[model samples]
Target: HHHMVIGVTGKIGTGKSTVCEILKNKYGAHVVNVDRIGHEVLEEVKEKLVELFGGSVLEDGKVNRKKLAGIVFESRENLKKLELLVHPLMKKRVQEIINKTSGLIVIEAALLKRMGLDQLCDHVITVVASRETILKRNREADRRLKFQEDIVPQGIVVANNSTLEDLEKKVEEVMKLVW
Candidate 1:
């Protein structure tokens, strides 16, 4: 089996997860979510997180992501502080998963460029949606955070502004090119 890694990235409410799900269910691709891996890394680095961000980033004796997000998203420096600690761990986990898997691997990550995970993919798909649609879906969609498209090699854009069926058709079009 050919080992192919495809990175899926986009801003908030852009349907990166939905694209990955379609790839998984319809195309039989293995889906890896960097956010899910980040959650695991949060547990592993709980001590360091508390030391850096303090106890406010914790609740009920555990790292509360909501609390952590409140602190990290406050400033660029703050988000970078968390990324400096988390990105390496997430990258390592991704590498390990890639090494063990074969066929198509679809990586769904909002921070694909930030974490430098785009380098691991044979192709990268950027999902896009209109500003109106995005804001309607996610209230926390910050206009400041943007995807750096220049660095993604062999990049493909998949516009997802309509129904799941519409998104699936768009994804399927990309699938043929990648496969």
Candidate 2:
């Protein structure tokens, strides 16, 4: 049995999670959300972050995501530093989950290319949409703005300007090629 590890990635507000959900509900594939795993690992790395950035970066028991985002997104150096801290942890956790899963695994992430996680996948799929559409979606989701040039790799691009039904059709078509 061939195990297919598909990495779904896109810029912010490109509906990567929605695509992952459709694959999970329709195709019975095991989905591993790397962002959530990264967040969990952030708890383990919170002390290190606090030491680096100080207590102002935390709230309650958790790291304040907004503050960290501001710090990293504003500076390329800080962004790389943050990625260096979180990417390995996320990769290790992803490998653990992949080892425990029985069959094809679908890993969803926003920073697949930046973190070099897409290279580990059997296939990489990038969900794409217009910048205006993405900006609108990000405004609705209250997410930080991200550029198209940020996350895309030289892989399959699924344009998602149409309805969910249209996106589902594209996903099905891609899966036929992949699986």
Candidate 3:
């Protein structure tokens, strides 16, 4: 293929979204936000969600994410059920994007490996920061951090504990390698 697909992933607060934005603005890459797709999927499957999780998952006629998160994050079993319902839909949408889009493509997803999106990428870049930094950014970080290890290895691991400028430089360096 003439186009390149790069998966940009990290746990919450590791700043993968920043990396993806740089790829979009600085490098003119097509950045696909997987979580945003998941949000859409949640709406599409809201009836099923209400069925499985009960009507409390809905608010104002939409799936209230905060309420759904409360249910899913409470137990591994619940989380797994949600993933089973959502990940395939998310992957299908991502695959459709990949097929139609051209040039540098960045798939920004925390669950790149879990969704099997990494298999579609030519390279997968993982952003990492110290636990202290993550905590400072998100007080809710500890809950999910305990659930999943975000560091899926190789094609590259970019440390993002520093300034935005430093992360941009590192991303540019990665651009050279991946481009």
Candidate 4:
């Protein structure tokens, strides 16, 4: 079957998850959350990280996320290096999931644009909100500590400034164009 791969992306705490959940629960679409996939890859690929960054990056056979994040986020070169280490595995796993799923599959990711995952999608949907709302949500979600303004991609934007009901209506409007 030809699967419709929808990329749902946004900046940190821009209600990407909320929109994705609405799409899944209301539209009956299969959702592949890339953050969850990355977590699994972090566990599955600990040995590779240990080999690259030495054994200290791993404790008890598990990768330390904070240490890894420090290594990557501190410099552009290091971030690219980490992306090289992780993006291939992520793509492989995502392709595998796409092969197995029968219907429209939504790839929910914060780094969708940075990692070029958006290119894999048949349609890309970006959730956008005011800077204040985004910052507040990020702080509340404990994600503000690692906020980077350059992460958001240039594409179709869905303004999520109002109520959940309004957001749902927006999603339905976009899906009609996509579906």
Candidate 5:
């Protein structure tokens, strides 16, 4: 009855989502994408958004995400405010998902450390990639913001600097430990 909540985290372009997909597709894991949870929470927090950022932050009666990001990213304090607003609700929703899901549940997120999502996991799967590979993938390799840190010695580390097949092999290799 022990369900393993795996925290799949890493920098942008580290192939975390790819691993999560394989985890879901091959390993039969119930993948929980925190970004998707955050979006869902926004649906619940629209009124709060209007209260905090005014009505202009909304578009067509929905919270304009890019507009909200524009306001929050410029100021760390504002970003923290937004995090405080959504993260708790996201955690609650994730807990709800966890309550229903059985066996391995993979939670994919880049801000797993910063948002304290790691605490909710049984094991943290740290994905790694070279900066050049990240750039070749068209992702900005130099992200100063977000959970940008080397959380080594925290959990199982998975490197994905090679082909998709290599990365798939890497996930399958370490998944034994994760499982």
Candidate 6:
């Protein structure tokens, strides 16, 4: 089978998971969430985080995500620094997931373009949400944290500003492009 990798990306509250799950449910596409994998990567790089951000980012001998986020979100450079540390591992595991799956695989990554995961994707779908919807969905949403993605002419955009049913409808439409 000629397995196709599809990238589903968006901001924190933009419903990328919903879209990916819909794709999986309807088409049996494999789903791999980058952030979820990144969490695993953090454990793999505990000493590195401590070296870069110091012990404050660690609590009880583990990487404290909230502490690390505060330090990373302090500056764009800091965010990139952490991404630099984590993304390589994340990409390797992502590709591993892609290789293991036989058919259409959906990669849900906020930093699809940044981490170079988009190269693995035959098609990219970006979920978008209005500011109000985003704020409503994630009350702790950081307005400053933004991933690098240019909604190009080739990539698809799925607006998730409305209800879940509407978003599923959009995912169904996008799935038509894959198979």
Question: Which candidate has the highest TM-score of all?
Answer: 3
Candidate 1 on 22-74: residue-level lDDT in tens?
89998888999898999999999999998899999999899999889888777
For candidate 2, the per-residue lDDT at 145 reads 49
Per-residue accuracy of model 6 over 31-126 as CA lDDT, tens digit each: 998888999999999998888888999888888888887788777788888988989999999988888778888998877887788999999988
What is the RMSD, in Å, between candidate 5 and the native fold over all Cα? 2.3
Model 5: per-residue lDDT, tens digit, 103-177?
999889887887787988998988888777776774445533243554442588888887899988888888876
Of candidates 2 and 1, the better by lDDT: 1
Clashes of 5: 0
Tens digit of per-residue lDDT, candidate 4, span 1-179: 67899999887777889998988998888999898888888888777788777776766667888777757666677667767888889988988998888788999987887777888888888888877777666653344325456566556689988888999899999988888
Top lDDT model:
3
TM-score head-to-head 4 vs 6, winner: 6
In terms of lDDT, model 3 sits at 0.89
State model 6's lDDT.
Answer: 0.81
TM-score of every model?
0.92, 0.90, 0.95, 0.85, 0.87, 0.90
Which stretches of model 3 miss by more than 4 angstroms? none
Runs with alpha carbons beyond 4 Å of true place in candidate 6? 144-154
Candidate lDDT (C-alpha), each: 0.85, 0.81, 0.89, 0.80, 0.81, 0.81
Spell out the clash pairs found in candidate 1: none
Q: Worst ten-residue run, lDDT, model 4?
A: 139-148
lDDT for model 5 comes to 0.81
Clashing pairs in 4: none
Model 4 misplaced stretches (Cα beyond 4 Å): 140-155
TM-score, structure 5 vs. true: 0.87
